[PDB]
Design an enzyme around this catalytic site. Structure first.
Site, mmCIF file in Angstrom:
data_model
loop_
_atom_site.group_PDB
_atom_site.id
_atom_site.type_symbol
_atom_site.label_atom_id
_atom_site.label_comp_id
_atom_site.label_asym_id
_atom_site.label_seq_id
_atom_site.Cartn_x
_atom_site.Cartn_y
_atom_site.Cartn_z
ATOM 1 N N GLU A 1 0.350 -1.229 0.080
ATOM 2 C CA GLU A 1 0.085 0.011 -0.200
ATOM 3 C C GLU A 1 0.742 1.237 -0.174
ATOM 4 O O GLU A 1 1.784 1.174 0.952
ATOM 5 C CB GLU A 1 -0.406 0.116 0.996
ATOM 6 C CG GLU A 1 -2.283 0.911 1.232
ATOM 7 C CD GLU A 1 -1.468 2.452 1.378
ATOM 8 O OE1 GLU A 1 -0.830 2.646 2.504
ATOM 9 O OE2 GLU A 1 -2.410 2.985 1.334
ATOM 10 N N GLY B 1 -2.324 -8.382 6.975
ATOM 11 C CA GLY B 1 -2.326 -8.868 6.037
ATOM 12 C C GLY B 1 -0.934 -9.376 4.984
ATOM 13 O O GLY B 1 -0.412 -9.392 4.701
ATOM 14 N N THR B 2 -0.569 -7.799 4.733
ATOM 15 C CA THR B 2 0.327 -8.125 3.689
ATOM 16 C C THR B 2 1.800 -8.102 5.120
ATOM 17 O O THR B 2 2.839 -8.639 4.505
ATOM 18 C CB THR B 2 0.850 -6.264 3.440
ATOM 19 O OG1 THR B 2 2.487 -6.290 2.696
ATOM 20 C CG2 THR B 2 0.752 -5.575 4.436
ATOM 21 N N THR C 1 -7.585 -4.169 17.138
ATOM 22 C CA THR C 1 -7.945 -2.956 16.690
ATOM 23 C C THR C 1 -9.017 -3.594 15.077
ATOM 24 O O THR C 1 -9.789 -3.086 14.015
ATOM 25 C CB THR C 1 -7.430 -2.103 15.039
ATOM 26 O OG1 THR C 1 -6.292 -2.227 16.368
ATOM 27 C CG2 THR C 1 -7.120 -1.427 14.986
ATOM 28 N N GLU D 1 25.579 -15.371 19.787
ATOM 29 C CA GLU D 1 26.518 -15.763 20.703
ATOM 30 C C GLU D 1 25.105 -15.917 21.115
ATOM 31 O O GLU D 1 24.785 -15.107 22.773
ATOM 32 C CB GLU D 1 27.032 -14.873 21.994
ATOM 33 C CG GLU D 1 28.818 -15.574 20.875
ATOM 34 C CD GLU D 1 29.642 -14.302 21.653
ATOM 35 O OE1 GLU D 1 30.643 -14.732 21.009
ATOM 36 O OE2 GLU D 1 29.428 -14.205 22.579
HETATM 37 N N1 GTP Z 1 3.444 -1.732 17.697
HETATM 38 C C1 GTP Z 1 3.031 -0.701 16.860
HETATM 39 N N2 GTP Z 1 1.639 -1.818 15.736
HETATM 40 C C2 GTP Z 1 1.434 -0.944 15.424
HETATM 41 C C3 GTP Z 1 1.254 0.411 14.574
HETATM 42 N N3 GTP Z 1 0.502 0.182 13.482
HETATM 43 C C4 GTP Z 1 -0.118 -0.813 12.882
HETATM 44 N N4 GTP Z 1 0.154 -1.708 14.267
HETATM 45 C C5 GTP Z 1 -0.286 -3.304 14.206
HETATM 46 O O1 GTP Z 1 -0.445 -4.120 13.374
HETATM 47 C C6 GTP Z 1 -2.219 -4.116 13.224
HETATM 48 C C7 GTP Z 1 -2.434 -4.459 11.768
HETATM 49 O O2 GTP Z 1 -1.491 -4.520 10.358
HETATM 50 P P1 GTP Z 1 -0.648 -3.322 9.714
HETATM 51 O O3 GTP Z 1 0.906 -3.228 9.797
HETATM 52 O O4 GTP Z 1 -1.546 -1.982 10.911
HETATM 53 O O5 GTP Z 1 -1.073 -3.050 8.555
HETATM 54 P P2 GTP Z 1 -0.265 -4.393 7.300
HETATM 55 O O6 GTP Z 1 0.476 -5.431 8.299
HETATM 56 O O7 GTP Z 1 0.647 -3.359 6.498
HETATM 57 O O8 GTP Z 1 -1.223 -5.270 6.718
HETATM 58 P P3 GTP Z 1 -2.430 -4.955 5.802
HETATM 59 O O9 GTP Z 1 -3.471 -4.741 6.502
HETATM 60 O O10 GTP Z 1 -2.245 -5.949 4.342
HETATM 61 O O11 GTP Z 1 -2.001 -3.947 5.337
HETATM 62 C C8 GTP Z 1 -2.592 -3.228 14.193
HETATM 63 O O12 GTP Z 1 -3.230 -4.570 14.689
HETATM 64 C C9 GTP Z 1 -1.234 -2.777 15.202
HETATM 65 O O13 GTP Z 1 -2.608 -2.966 16.294
HETATM 66 C C10 GTP Z 1 2.195 0.860 14.856
HETATM 67 O O14 GTP Z 1 2.611 1.804 15.038
HETATM 68 N N5 GTP Z 1 3.441 0.394 16.160
HETATM 69 N N1 GDP Z 2 39.789 -10.691 34.396
HETATM 70 C C1 GDP Z 2 38.876 -10.366 33.319
HETATM 71 N N2 GDP Z 2 38.092 -11.444 32.853
HETATM 72 C C2 GDP Z 2 36.765 -11.565 31.333
HETATM 73 C C3 GDP Z 2 36.962 -9.995 31.169
HETATM 74 N N3 GDP Z 2 36.108 -9.519 29.576
HETATM 75 C C4 GDP Z 2 35.384 -11.340 30.407
HETATM 76 N N4 GDP Z 2 36.211 -11.521 31.080
HETATM 77 C C5 GDP Z 2 35.890 -12.679 31.703
HETATM 78 O O1 GDP Z 2 35.271 -13.913 30.202
HETATM 79 C C6 GDP Z 2 34.194 -14.435 30.534
HETATM 80 C C7 GDP Z 2 33.797 -14.509 29.004
HETATM 81 O O2 GDP Z 2 34.251 -14.996 28.325
HETATM 82 P P1 GDP Z 2 34.911 -14.339 26.637
HETATM 83 O O3 GDP Z 2 34.593 -12.928 26.273
HETATM 84 O O4 GDP Z 2 33.075 -15.282 25.743
HETATM 85 O O5 GDP Z 2 35.618 -15.083 25.722
HETATM 86 P P2 GDP Z 2 35.923 -15.202 24.376
HETATM 87 O O6 GDP Z 2 34.527 -16.765 24.092
HETATM 88 O O7 GDP Z 2 37.322 -16.551 24.212
HETATM 89 O O8 GDP Z 2 36.053 -14.060 23.806
HETATM 90 C C8 GDP Z 2 33.207 -13.405 31.113
HETATM 91 O O9 GDP Z 2 32.814 -15.043 32.701
HETATM 92 C C9 GDP Z 2 34.157 -12.747 32.349
HETATM 93 O O10 GDP Z 2 34.136 -12.864 33.783
HETATM 94 C C10 GDP Z 2 38.227 -8.848 31.879
HETATM 95 O O11 GDP Z 2 38.504 -8.020 30.640
HETATM 96 N N5 GDP Z 2 39.293 -9.285 32.379
HETATM 97 MG MG MG Z 3 -1.619 -1.386 5.545
#
Ligand code: GTP
Ligand code: GDP
Ligand code: MG
Ligand code: GTP
Ligand code: GDP
Ligand code: MG
Lengths: 38, 430, 67, 430, 97, 430, 430
Positions: free
Chosen positions: G62, G135-136, G170, G245
């Site tokens: 649309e 829909g869309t 809605t 991760e």
């Molecule tokens: N959080 C949030 N939800 C929205 C917003 N606008 C529409 N919605 C939700 O979207 C639902 C309907 O889908 P829409 O996004 O409005 O329309 P569409 O996904 O383009 O589908 P069509 O009706 O075919 O055009 C409604 O039930 C609303 O709750 C928005 O700006 N913020």
């Molecule tokens: N002493 C120390 N420990 C760290 C630091 N940054 C992360 N860790 C430890 O490392 C753990 C996470 O390891 P990670 O970063 O995922 O290791 P990788 O997967 O090899 O990158 C966490 O539980 C932290 O406690 C640091 O700057 N100093």
């Molecule tokens: Mg629409």
């Protein structure tokens, strides 16, 4: 003497043996040990 | 690392809370905006950069007073969402604020209390203020005390209740809810202090020489008493006293914890400096029956224990030399089973003056908290007032129709009879 | 365990460590005899890596066929 | 060698130590920054008695400070000579006792004492040759009189052969600052007799009397009482830190002043004491010192020493003087007062001479006498205790924390037995 | 010697007077109490519970050899270190055995 | 001569190295531009241990940095002393592992490791006499715990006679930052025992505890934990770079601290550690160092060393001090704690002295003790592993990349067998 | 060298894409014209000289919303021919956008996706936004996901779907296409985040104190959540987290990947600075059931795994000290087979404020992504709504006449029943 009393405390036997009774027991054993050594 | 939380409920409670919170902000140098242009920690909390937030919560079902607070000069000080407000007033009906509309508000107050308590690390206890002769005040105070007594347990709570005067009264139904609230806080509060308005009116008239006082003048004196009581927690002193060091010194038995206070000196700047204000004369004035802060005569009963606080440049030897003189006098007699009955505290910080107020600046002051056997008269007269209308069941329909049972009135009467018998039983010599 | 500890206990204190090492090792064929896997007599990704290496080698061999 | 460690508890003990350590540092020429700036060689020879050595050449006291609330130690640190104390030795709780002996001895004091006992054990195990411990605390407070006395038993259980000193302030009935003083005084005296090798009672009333009558200064304060107590405390161990004609350590006094193991409650006094305006009139001579030393008003206790007979006496002279004069004066003070000295033990006065006088004075004397007149203090304490206990006043505070009335009855009986058997020897004749 | 005097003294008083029993009963009661406290302290008790755990490494083998040596008085072992004569004492309630 | 190369992997290992190399450069006086500006001659004699020489007189570390994502090495280059690292040694992938052990050990880590092994081989073949390798990595991450451990096996297969060090951070259950920590911890411990000659466990929880309790600083950060780990790392090889009374290379420690080839998991600690405000109070003496060295809270692991018995211990003293005092103190720390030392191996403490102290300190000690108390960490890791594995939670991520549950079962069984046979010697008696 | 591509389809998707693209441009300093007056590379691409082009594509059948975009202030930013637009709307009919008009548009979108992907070298994954109840949106999202799952394979795709509220709606036919789209993305999307409007309305009302919110206020909060999620890829941090991760830490089983989010703090500038916003209080607020971003009660179910991101000046030790407190509470219980369930990330860049918006500027913030067993309630209520109308085959003719078969409705019902059974089977303890 205090190390042996700590043994009595640690084994929850301090209710059955006072500090004065413990000192008296240690004294009697000391006397007889010394008589045996001599 | 020592903290205290003050609870303000009802119109009188909020109006005395305002009075104490100008005084604390003035005493710690904090501007009304909350900004300073390590003693603050007892009443305040640091936000990290700049302003300080009071450790206080304001409660009321009727929105006028809170709206007045939120538009005055102190609008920036209090946290916006700790001024809990209702929509409908209890209208002097105790059953309303305990059974009908207070229950839906009490949960928010308890959530706020938890959120304030988790911040404190060394919580000493709670303070609560409530005018007893009103619906929302008495009812919500009772409900909050009952919830706190089980949520926290052994934490100490102090109550600065304002009982009605012997003959002067503003309502017509206040004995009923006064008796019910006394029932409620008898088994739930650790300390209760008497504060009826007539005695303070007489104090203002005689000493301050004001012939037309308003509520603000009364609330300023109450605020000064509170500041004197809590000074020892936030200022260096030669003889300190803590809140937890009270039930061990003023409360002989768990039931007996109602005591009456006094303050000295009370004098205006126009004639204050003409006399020396020695410690002996101020400690004599504090024990004068006409300077009691509650309209009760101490000459009609024995003393049980006296806890009395000094602040300023007072020296302990002068205090002892004055306690001896009081023990000498024949018009003041203590109970037989109490040889010594005085607990003395000395602090160095002189009382602070509020600009535009009544009291002048002085270097010495004394505040006494005394437990005496003569307090039974107020209970007896309130009981007599209650019985007159309860004989014909007047005004009862306003309470039965708000969920309260018929028998709830009788047991409060029985508890008051028990208290009066206990006070007589304690005061007899062995 | 048993029968192998009573046999190790019949060997003098100087050779008892060597006999204990031989008994642990003799524990080695027995499991294979008990079970049937010629790879328990010492001390996604594996399969994938082996497969990939073999495939590349196979392609090289294919290239040898191509040669 | 033969050094002692310092342990203090409670607010009163902390305030006593805050002046005792200042006096010691001024005597040894140690600046508030821990740097020696003294004049004489002897000022450094025996500094290991009270001070430890750290890197950078500064000295640190081997003191341990304990309390159940952080305020007093947070205040003593900002005072003069407050930086000397090692920050690691500060141990405190977050709740306090509220002058309740049960809370400071059963519930709260039991859990905290492990940490302070750890540092106490660290200090004692390390030192070259232990002489003993000295304890400063007050019997009028809850946390002090509870935790200190339980710590006494814990220390005695681990070091049965070392010597133990206690400087104890007992609550006098004249100047009373706490209503629950008799309870925790009577409970503490029960435990104190069983474990303390020496005890020295000090009364605020006697200190005020001395300050008002001998020094004749207008406004006494706690600083003057602390200074007198500190001078008396320093006088006892002077010859252990300085050379002299007849050195006499604490154990030698223990041998010569305690006839029977349960009679170890002494009262002390310091001489000379003169007013500012009369300090030029007087001439310092041995007769002038000895006449003031045995003066009844000069005792640090309200007990009247001519109401009983001395079992023994001791004097620790300071300054350079002839021994013949000292001995003849001691004989003369014993021949002219034969009625007040017990007759079945002849020559019951011990004397010692130290050649190093106090800074600013040429001669000084410390008096420690074991007399039968001390019975009057226990008599009045027990009288107040039995006047208050017969009605079970304030008993619920103690009984709510695991304590019972049986321990009160046993304490009263043991205290009365002590009173009786202390006077038993007064009427004894040969 | 102190432990023997201590056991004899503690169990010579009410409420637990064992003076009617052999002194060994008082001493055994001290060891039983020490075992109970050792067990309570949440600390290992294997040395109290298994008396045959005297030797390192071969405790189960020694237990099996002791059972065979007791089941039949001298069971010949193919590979056992040494036979030691020990004494067990039982108390029997027999009139004039 | 006898030099070692540095290899680090993962983000945690890279952050550890970023401070380890700063500490080493500050110790040897190398500016962040690679130019020597030191003061002492000894600062250059043994610089070949860690640094290579290039044209222009500048020095370059022989470190190899590897990770599966480029962010951490792109960040460490902009930090201080980041320019020292040779750009050629930086090897990285474009995908990452996402904390998945299978991806970092089977699919992605297998193809990349050839390039890093090429530079590793280049570095080792060239050096004068190889001593060994030291490895820093974390067991809580996927790419680290996978690629590092596979690289350990690849290096061991090619250099079976050299020595291998690993400083391994194991995930504690208290401070958990990743939900899949038990899986890749248990899988890594299986491979680590088979190939590493030495392993040193480090826990973030113990580092936070140390920073909060001993240093007493308000806001710990990763920079402080890295600094402590770096000081501990430098302390081990100090005597290999400086002269001393008893030189002791890594192989000598390997001989004396590992009784059986599978028991090579040590926990370490560094002394002295003091707060900023108490650095003037303390005096640095050998007793003060040795009392803090054996302190339970000083260990770099949460494992409680008085819950088990030490198989052996080692200490590497720094600074100029007398050997007689060191030996007598080591004997005293072993006589007073005989209950916590295994009895069938006498004299189980090794000592070494290096005459060059750390910059800014006069004495320092590094402690490396092999104790039976380490079983508790594997117990809790296996407990969490078996709690999560019984439901096959998060198992599909690992099983989708060629791994199966059989390798999980074998790893769990081998880890439990290690736990059992490590405590087997705790109950062993002679 | 790390990139991500965001897909916006439908009116709600485009309106939230606008919301996130003001925020990203503001956070990286890029003016609305696209010109700056190395962190941008994650979301943008450099054109060689001057402007930056977003890595985003806008889809809709649309044309009104796209035409509004192409005339606003951001007309110069987006590439003119990546705003794919149709002519005829699907009109809330799912079968239209999956079988009739979406097929002719999907080829252009796939060509654009290829042209954007060939530019990236380190493509982390895809982001997609679509309101489910249209829909869309639902139809084209399903078709695009199905095409991408086979064109690229193992690349990760994240879906920020907005499910309908429990009672507020809605449309009248949105349960049908919601169920069908859930069927489609159940086996095709790696992560799905819950975003229903009612919960965010309550959040705005309670915290932001807005009584008349519009869609822009909701979309700004969603944009802030997206920025908090993706901050770790383009800013330096002590504990980084990548998109890949996640399935190793939050997804126990391939079927279960629906989780609900929360954010804290949410507060206006009028009362933000009065309180300190400590890390403990914000991490407590994030776990409050009333602050869930989806209207589900976490108290009704167990937790499986919690991944929660911090940004600002937060220190890891304070994070651990707060995770411990949450583990302590009795109202939050985790599943039995998960001992540790927290993954923690820490970033240094504080959240950026949009001028004229609702949120104020703060130094600390927390965003949590939590997988819990309680999510089954929304599936159950949507299923109940679906069954009511599917019993009578209402509105089915609008779907059968657009090419969809009759039986296609039943199998979605069977898959929802299977999902609900699986959620019950997982949550039972062993
Ligand atoms: N959080 C949030 N939800 C929205 C917003 N606008 C529409 N919605 C939700 O979207 C639902 C309907 O889908 P829409 O996004 O409005 O329309 P569409 O996904 O383009 O589908 P069509 O009706 O075919 O055009 C409604 O039930 C609303 O709750 C928005 O700006 N913020
Ligand atoms: N002493 C120390 N420990 C760290 C630091 N940054 C992360 N860790 C430890 O490392 C753990 C996470 O390891 P990670 O970063 O995922 O290791 P990788 O997967 O090899 O990158 C966490 O539980 C932290 O406690 C640091 O700057 N100093
Ligand atoms: Mg629409
Ligand atoms: N000392 C003092 N007493 C007050 C003040 N205001 C009201 N009171 C007393 O409070 C009693 C009635 O209770 P209020 O506080 O006025 O009203 P309330 O407690 O809010 O109860 P409601 O009537 O339901 O609103 C009166 O009898 C007054 O004596 C005050 O400002 N100072
Ligand atoms: N000499 C002296 N006595 C004091 C001082 N402060 C308090 N006291 C005495 O200590 C008594 C109260 O003890 P308290 O402070 O309650 O002891 P605590 O309970 O251990 O804190 C009072 O009766 C005072 O006489 C002081 O600074 N100097
Ligand atoms: Mg009102």
């Amino acid at each position: 003497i205090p190390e042996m009393y700590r043994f009595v405390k640690d084994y929850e036997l301090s209710d059955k043996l006072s500090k004065e009774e413990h000192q008296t027991l240690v004294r009697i054993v000391s006397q007889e040990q010394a008589k045996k050594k001599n | 690392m020592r903290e205290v939380i003050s609870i303000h409920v009802g119109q009188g409670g909020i109006q005395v809370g305002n009075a104490c919170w100008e005084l604390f902000c003035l005493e710690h140098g904090i501007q009304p905006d909350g900004q300073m242009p390590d003693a603050f920690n007892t009443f305040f909390s640091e936000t990290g950069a700049g302003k300080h937030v009071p450790r206080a919560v304001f409660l009321d079902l009727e929105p006028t007073v809170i709206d007045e607070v939120r538009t005055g000069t102190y609008r920036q000080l209090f946290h916006p969402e700790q001024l809990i407000s209702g929509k409908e007033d209890a209208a002097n009906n105790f059953a309303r604020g305990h059974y009908t509309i207070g229950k839906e508000i009490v949960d928010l107050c308890l959530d706020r209390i938890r959120k304030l308590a988790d911040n404190c690390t060394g919580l000493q206890g709670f303070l609560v203020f409530n005018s007893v002769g009103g619906g929302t005040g008495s009812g919500l105070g009772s409900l909050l005390l009952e919830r706190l007594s089980v949520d926290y347990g052994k934490k100490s709570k102090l109550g600065f209740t304002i009982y009605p005067s012997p003959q002067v009264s503003t309502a017509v139904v206040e004995p009923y809810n006064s008796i019910l609230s006394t029932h409620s806080l008898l088994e739930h509060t650790d300390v209760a202090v008497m504060l009826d308005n007539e005695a303070i009116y007489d104090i203002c008239r005689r000493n301050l020489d004001i012939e037309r006082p308003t509520y603000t003048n009364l609330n300023r004196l109450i605020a000064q008493v509170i500041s004197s009581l809590t000074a020892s927690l936030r200022f260096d002193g030669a003889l300190n006293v803590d809140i937890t060091e009270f039930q061990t010194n003023l409360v002989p038995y768990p039931r007996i914890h109602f005591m009456l206070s006094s303050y000295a000196p009370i004098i205006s700047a126009e004639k204050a400096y003409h006399e020396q204000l020695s410690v002996a004369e101020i400690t004599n004035s504090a024990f004068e029956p006409a300077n009691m802060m509650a309209k009760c005569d101490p000459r009609h009963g024995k003393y049980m224990a006296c806890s009395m606080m000094y602040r300023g440049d007072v020296v302990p030897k002068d205090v002892n030399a004055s306690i001896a003189t009081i023990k000498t006098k024949r018009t003041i007699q203590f109970v037989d089973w109490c040889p010594t009955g005085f607990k003395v505290g000395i602090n160095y910080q002189p009382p602070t003056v509020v600009p535009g107020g009544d009291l002048a600046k002085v270097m010495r002051a004394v505040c006494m908290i005394s437990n005496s056997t003569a307090i039974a008269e107020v209970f007896s007269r309130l009981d007599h007032k209650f019985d007159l209308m309860y004989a014909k069941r007047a005004f009862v329909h306003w309470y039965v129709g708000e969920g309260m049972e018929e028998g709830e009135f009788s047991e409060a009467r029985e508890d008051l009879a028990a208290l009066e018998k206990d006070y007589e039983e304690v005061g007899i010599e062995t | 365990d048993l029968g192998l500890k009573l046999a190790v206990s019949t060997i003098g204190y100087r050779d008892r460590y060597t006999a204990e090492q031989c008994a642990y090792c003799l524990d080695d064929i027995i499991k294979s005899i008990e079970t049937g896997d010629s790879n328990q007599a010492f001390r996604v990704i594996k399969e994938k890596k082996k497969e990939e290496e073999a495939q590349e080698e196979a392609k090289k061999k294919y290239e040898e066929k191509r040669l | 060698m033969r050094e002692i460690v310092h342990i203090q508890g409670g607010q009163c003990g902390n305030q006593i130590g805050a002046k005792f350590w200042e006096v010691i540092s001024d005597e040894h020429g140690i600046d508030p920054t821990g740097t020696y700036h003294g004049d004489s060689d002897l000022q450094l020879e025996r500094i290991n008695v009270y001070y430890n050595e750290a890197t950078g050449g500064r000295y640190v006291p081997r003191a341990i400070l304990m309390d159940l609330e952080p305020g007093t130690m947070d205040s003593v640190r900002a005072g003069p000579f407050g930086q000397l104390f090692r920050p690691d030795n500060f141990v405190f709780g977050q709740t306090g006792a509220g002058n309740n002996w049960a809370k400071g001895h059963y519930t709260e004091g039991a859990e905290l004492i492990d940490s302070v006992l750890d540092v106490v054990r660290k200090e004692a195990e390390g030192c070259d040759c232990l002489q003993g411990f000295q304890i400063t605390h007050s019997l009028g407070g809850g946390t002090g009189s509870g935790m200190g006395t339980l710590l006494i038993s814990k220390v005695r259980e681990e070091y049965p052969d070392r010597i133990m000193e206690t400087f104890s302030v007992v609550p006098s009935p004249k100047v009373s600052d706490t209503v629950v003083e008799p309870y925790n005084a009577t409970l503490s005296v029960h435990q104190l007799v069983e474990n303390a090798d020496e005890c020295m009672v000090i009364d605020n009333e006697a200190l005020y009397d001395i300050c008002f009558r001998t020094l004749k200064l207008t406004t006494p304060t706690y600083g003057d009482l602390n200074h007198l107590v500190s001078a008396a405390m320093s006088g006892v161990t002077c010859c252990l830190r300085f050379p002299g004609q007849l050195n006499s350590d604490l154990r030698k006094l223990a041998v010569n002043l305690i006839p029977f193991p349960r009679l170890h409650f002494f009262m002390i006094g310091f001489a000379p004491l003169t007013s500012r305006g009369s300090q030029q009139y007087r001439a310092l001579t041995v007769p002038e010192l000895t006449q003031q030393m045995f003066d009844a008003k000069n005792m640090m206790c309200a007990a009247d020493p001519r109401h009983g007979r001395y079992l023994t006496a001791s004097a620790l002279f300071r300054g350079r003087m002839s021994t013949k004069e000292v001995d003849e004066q001691m004989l003369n003070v014993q021949n002219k007062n034969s009625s007040y000295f017990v007759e079945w033990i002849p020559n019951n006065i011990k004397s010692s001479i130290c050649d190093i006088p106090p800074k600013g004075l040429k001669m000084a004397v410390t008096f420690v006498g074991n007399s039968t007149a001390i019975q009057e203090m226990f008599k009045r304490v027990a009288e107040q205790f039995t006047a208050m206990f017969r009605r079970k006043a304030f008993l619920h505070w103690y009984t709510g924390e695991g304590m019972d009335e049986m321990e009160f009855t046993e304490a009263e009986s043991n205290m009365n037995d002590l009173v009786s058997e202390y006077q038993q020897y007064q009427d004894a004749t040969a | 010697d102190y432990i023997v005097q201590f056991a004899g003294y503690i169990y010579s008083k009410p409420p637990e007077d064992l003076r009617h029993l052999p002194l060994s009963a008082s001493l055994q009661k001290v060891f039983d109490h020490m075992r109970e406290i050792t067990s309570k302290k949440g600390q290992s008790t294997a040395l109290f519970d298994d008396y045959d755990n005297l030797f390192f490494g071969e405790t189960e083998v020694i237990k099996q050899f002791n059972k065979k040596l007791e089941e039949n008085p001298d069971y010949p072992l193919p590979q056992g270190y040494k036979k030691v004569k020990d004494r067990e004492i039982k108390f029997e309630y027999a009139l004039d055995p």
